[PDB]
Design a protein around this ligand. Structure first.
Ligand SMILES: NC(=O)Nc1ccccc1
Ligand SMILES: NC(=O)Nc1ccccc1
Ligand SMILES: NC(=O)Nc1ccccc1
Ligand SMILES: NC(=O)Nc1ccccc1
Ligand SMILES: [Ca+2]
Ligand SMILES: [Ca+2]
Ligand SMILES: [Ca+2]
Ligand SMILES: [Ca+2]
Ligand SMILES: [Ca+2]
Ligand SMILES: [Ca+2]
Ligand SMILES: [Ca+2]
Ligand SMILES: [Ca+2]
Lengths: 78, 147, 80, 145
C-alpha cells in the first residue's frame, strides 16, 4: 500500500509534468490559468512523493529495529 | 475524446460500407473474411467469428451500423488516450532510443523551470523502473501514466 | 490485462505444488501418500490451467492485431 | 496459526528481557536500554514508534498480552516466510541467488513431472520481473505469495 501511494504520487508528478509541458510548449496561445492549475497540482504531488518516500525510508529502519527485538524474544524458544 | 462528433459519425457511416460488401446493412463473418484477405491476412473461421462476436452487442450474429459505431467510438476514445501518452513519451525520451534516462527527465523538469534535486529526479526514475535497468522504457512509462 | 495476471497466478500454483511435492517426497521421514497424491493432483490442474490461459492469451494477441487492422481500415474515412 | 502453551510460557520469560524494572509493562525508555545493549541507538521517535506498533490499548506501554499477540503474529509470518525460503534454496540449486530455466527443468525431471522445456521456460518468464531470464528471491516471493 505504502509502495502504491509512493508510485501513485510519482505518477502524478509525471502526469502533471506532461500537462504543464503540453500547455506551455505545444499550444499556439498559452492558457495561463490552465498552466497555473497543473503547476499547483505538480507541487502538491511532489510534496506528496517527498513525504511518502521519507516515510518509506523510516519504515525500513524501523523494520530492522523491530526485528532485532523480535529475535531477542525468540532466544527464549526451545 | 469521450464522444464522436456529428462529422465523425457520418464518416464512420461511410466506413461501414467498406465492410458491408453486399450493402445489406449488416457485416457478417463471411464479409470480414473477404475484407481481411483483401488486406493480405487469412484469419481462421473462429477468428473471424470472434471479431464479429466482440462487436455484436445484440447477439444476432451480424454487426449493424449502431454496433459498429459504438465500437468505433470506444476505439477512438482509447486511441486518443494512448496517442497522448506516446506523445509524452517521445518528448521525455529526448534521444529516441526507447529509454528515458535520469538525465533526460532532468532536462524536461529544468526546461519547465521546476526545481528538483538530481537525487529527486533519480528517485522518480527508480519508482517507474520496473525491470531495474535504471531507465524508463515505453511499457514502464505507460504503466506510470495510466496508474 | 487481467488475463496476464491469471496466467501468472496459474504458474504460481504450479510452483507452489511443485514445492509441496518436493517437500512431501524428499524432505520427510515417512512419506504421506494421500498428501503427495493431493499435491500431484493440484499440480496437474494448475498445469492444465496455465496451458489454457496461455493459449487464450496468445490467441488474444493475434486477434488484437487483426481487429486493429479492421479499425485502421474504418479510420481511413476520417478527414484529417 | 496459534502459539502452543509452551511457546506462550517461553514468551512470558522473554517479556522479562524487555521489562527491565519488572513492573509488568515495557516502556519507551526500556526499549532504549534494550536496543543500546544490542549495539543500536534509535531516536526517541523510533522507540516511540516501536511501542506504538504493539500498544493495542494505546496507554503508552506494552503489557504481556499485547507483547504476546504481536509475537504470535510474528511467529506466524516467520513460518510462512521460512517455508518460501526453503523452496527457493531447493530450486536455486547452485545457490547463486537465481533460479535458472535449467535449474527448474531439472527439478521437474527429478520429480518425474512431464513438462515440456518450453512450458518450464514460460514459467520462468511469467516470474521474471526484471527480464534477466532467471528468477531471483524477490521475484520468487512475489510468485509464491
Ligand atoms: N543475547 C543475544 O545474543 N541477543 C540477540 C542477538 C542477536 C539478535 C537479537 C538479540
Ligand atoms: N472485432 C472487431 O473489431 N470487428 C470489426 C472492427 C471494425 C469493423 C468491423 C468489425
Ligand atoms: N485501403 C487501405 O490502404 N487500407 C488499409 C491499409 C493499411 C492498414 C489498414 C487498412
Ligand atoms: N514494534 C515492535 O516490534 N516493538 C517491540 C517488539 C518486540 C518487543 C518489544 C517491542
Ligand atoms: Ca452485408
Ligand atoms: Ca448485431
Ligand atoms: Ca533516451
Ligand atoms: Ca526500466
Ligand atoms: Ca517496565
Ligand atoms: Ca498498552
Ligand atoms: Ca541458481
Ligand atoms: Ca529475473
Amino acid at each position: 500500500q505504502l509502495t502504491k501511494r509512493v508510485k501513485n504520487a510519482a505518477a502524478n508528478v509525471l502526469r502533471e509534468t506532461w500537462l504543464i509541458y503540453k500547455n506551455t510548449k505545444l499550444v499556439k496561445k498559452i492558457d495561463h490559468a490552465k498552466v497555473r492549475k497543473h503547476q499547483r497540482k505538480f507541487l502538491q504531488a511532489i510534496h506528496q512523493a517527498r513525504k511518502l518516500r521519507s516515510v518509506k525510508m523510516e519504515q525500513r529502519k524501523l523494520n530492522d529495529q523491530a526485528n532485532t527485538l523480535v529475535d531477542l524474544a525468540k532466544t527464549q524458544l526451545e | 475524446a469521450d464522444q464522436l462528433t456529428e462529422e465523425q459519425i457520418a464518416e464512420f457511416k461511410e466506413a461501414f460500407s467498406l465492410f458491408d460488401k453486399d450493402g445489406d446493412g449488416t457485416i457478417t463473418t463471411k464479409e470480414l473474411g473477404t475484407v481481411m484477405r483483401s488486406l493480405g491476412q487469412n484469419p481462421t473461421e473462429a477468428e473471424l467469428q470472434d471479431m464479429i462476436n466482440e462487436v455484436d452487442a445484440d447477439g444476432n450474429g451480424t454487426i449493424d451500423f449502431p454496433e459498429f459505431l459504438t465500437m468505433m467510438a470506444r476505439k477512438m476514445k482509447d486511441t486518443d488516450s494512448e496517442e497522448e501518452i506516446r506523445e509524452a513519451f517521445r518528448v521525455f525520451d529526448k534521444d529516441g532510443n526507447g529509454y528515458i534516462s535520469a538525465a533526460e527527465l532532468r532536462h524536461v523538469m529544468t526546461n519547465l523551470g521546476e526545481k528538483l534535486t538530481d537525487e529527486e529526479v533519480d528517485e522518480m526514475i527508480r519508482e517507474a523502473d520496473i525491470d531495474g535497468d535504471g531507465q524508463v522504457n515505453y511499457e514502464e512509462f505507460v504503466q506510470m501514466m495510466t496508474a
